[PDB]
């Protein structure tokens, strides 16, 4: 039955994973770049906490940004329901994917397959886009879906991703939050393969136990202390079995990761996921020797310090042209700090800024909307330097001073930190600041959009203040040199010196 208020199907355990994946990919969904799977106790009863709410909201935001798939129980019981709510909220403000897996026997109501729909034990989730049901049998027998779920994950992990980073593979991170009887089994079966999991060291009782562990008597004591009710109710015979699982879970720690309780930063979730994936990739040992792929993987996420300390190390061959591709991507990927690291770690910017690379950057990555806005602005005002800049961009789209071209490109797209980083390298430092202030002030009075005018005015004022302070210090150092710099005219930067630009842009403060 498919109901609209995504397709909902009932599947037998004999269904082939390959065919199901082929259907899901070819028919409805697009290529998956990452799979986040959440495992929590199937019990409906649950208690929310402020930190858990924030953590899961940030997880959903990260998944949406990357475009990962989300797999959950989808039984409309407690936490899962909240997750669905969050998804719907993000749908209100290209689309998130949330697959729920459950069993036919649990479902209270059954409707035969036009479209058959019903509006309303264990009622199914309402916000989940796609749902599946297990129809093996044993209506009264629960906990049947688990097996199939695992078979679904592994096939995805082993299959080639045919995508950049992670050595042509897929993350498939496994997640743990909360304590449950089936949580240990799920974690053990996930860790059996090369599937790293991260466990939140928060409310989760079993999660707290696992975090604390990182002897049989010690494990038993910890388990008894943390979950007195479950241990007391459970028979002694089963406990031994549980211990075995724990051992395996604790035997392999390189895959296992835990979130620190003290940490309160926003990016804690991203840090944990990135570190876990980095551990897995490095310990794979199939491609651990190489450093280009690892550097790219760490660049995809904004882990600059870890990437530095690991990849670059000390007394390690950095290569002369190795950083070319990574820094090119960083410039495309808008990672100012990585660009600064590359520049200060040995990269030669003058050599890299070749004619071909600049032509490629200006030809395609240039925003079409920005191109049209610049064309209309040049048509309207057409000042002395507007024609110069427009001619330069047109020439590159079809005594070179490529640095000024790169700086202009960075400014035109309203990038603050990257623009400042590029500014810290130019030769004509002061004149560039005045030119940028004039260029921003030209558009400051567009009046089409209220917000962008404020941002542009603030940027122009900041550049003006920087220029004023720089020249003040320069004059306080040497008087005659400052005057010579004032009279000096750059190598056709705009055909004008600092004074002319300052007077043209009605810069009263600079002249005063």
């Amino acid at each position: 039955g498919d109901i609209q208020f995504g397709k909902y199907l009932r599947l037998s355990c004999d269904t082939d994973s390959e065919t199901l994946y082929e259907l899901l990919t070819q028919h409805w969904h697009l290529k998956t770049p990452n799979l986040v799977i959440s495992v929590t106790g199937g019990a409906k009863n649950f208690a929310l906490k402020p930190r858990m709410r924030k953590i899961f909201s940030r997880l959903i935001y990260i998944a949406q940004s990357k475009g990962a798939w989300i797999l959950t129980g989808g039984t409309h019981y407690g936490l899962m329901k909240y997750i669905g709510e969050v998804v719907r909220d993000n749908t209100i403000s290209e689309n998130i994917v949330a697959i729920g897996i459950a069993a036919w026997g649990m479902v209270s109501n059954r409707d035969t397959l036009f479209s058959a729909q019903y509006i309303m034990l264990y009622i199914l989730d309402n916000n989940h886009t796609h749902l599946l049901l297990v129809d093996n049998g044993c209506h009264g027998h629960p906990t049947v879906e688990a097996k199939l779920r695992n078979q679904l994950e592994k096939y995805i992990s082993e299959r080639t991703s045919q995508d950049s980073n992670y050595g042509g593979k897929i993350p498939i991170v496994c997640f743990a939050q909360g304590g449950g009887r089936e949580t240990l089994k799920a974690i053990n079966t996930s860790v059996k393969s090369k599937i790293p999991c991260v466990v939140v060291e928060g409310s989760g009782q079993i999660a707290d136990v696992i975090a604390s562990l990182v002897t049989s008597s010690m494990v038993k004591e910890k388990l008894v202390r943390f979950l007195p009710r479950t241990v007391s109710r459970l028979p002694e015979e089963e406990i031994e079995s549980w211990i075995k699982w724990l051992k395996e879970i604790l035997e392999s720690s390189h895959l296992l990761t835990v979130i620190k309780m003290e940490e309160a930063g926003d990016e804690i979730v991203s840090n944990a996921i990135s570190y876990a994936l980095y551990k897995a990739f490095s310990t794979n040992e199939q491609d651990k020797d190489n450093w280009n792929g690892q550097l790219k993987l760490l660049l995809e996420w904004n882990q600059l310090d870890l990437a530095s300390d690991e990849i670059f190390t000390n007394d390690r061959r950095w290569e002369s042209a190795d950083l070319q591709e990574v820094m090119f991507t960083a410039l495309i990927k808008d990672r100012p700090k990585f660009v600064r690291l590359f520049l200060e770690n040995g990269l030669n910017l003058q050599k890299f800024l070749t004619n071909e690379v600049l032509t490629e950057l200006f030809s395609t990555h240039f925003s079409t909307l920005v191109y049209r806005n610049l064309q209309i602005a040049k048509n309207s005002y057409n000042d002395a330097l507007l024609t110069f800049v427009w001619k330069l961009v047109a020439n590159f789209r079809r005594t070179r001073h490529p640095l000024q071209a790169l700086f202009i490109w960075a400014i035109l797209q309203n990038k603050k930190e990257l623009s400042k980083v590029i500014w810290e390298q130019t030769k004509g430092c002061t004149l560039a600041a005045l030119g940028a202030s004039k260029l921003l002030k030209t558009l400051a009075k567009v009046k089409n959009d209220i917000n962008a005018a404020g941002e542009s005015e603030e940027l122009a004022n900041e550049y003006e203040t920087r220029a004023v302070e720089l020249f003040t210090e320069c004059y306080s150092n040497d008087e005659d040199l400052a005057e010579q710099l004032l009279v000096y005219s750059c190598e056709a930067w705009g055909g004008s010196n600092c004074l002319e630009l300052a007077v043209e842009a009605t810069d009263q403060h600079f002249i005063a």
């Binding site: 199907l9 599947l11 269904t15 065919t19 259907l23 028919h27």
Partner: peptide
């Protein structure tokens, strides 16, 4: 259209 082939595919 697709539903028939899908149903036959899983059976």
């Amino acid at each position: 259209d697709l539903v028939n082939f899908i149903q036959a595919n899983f059976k």
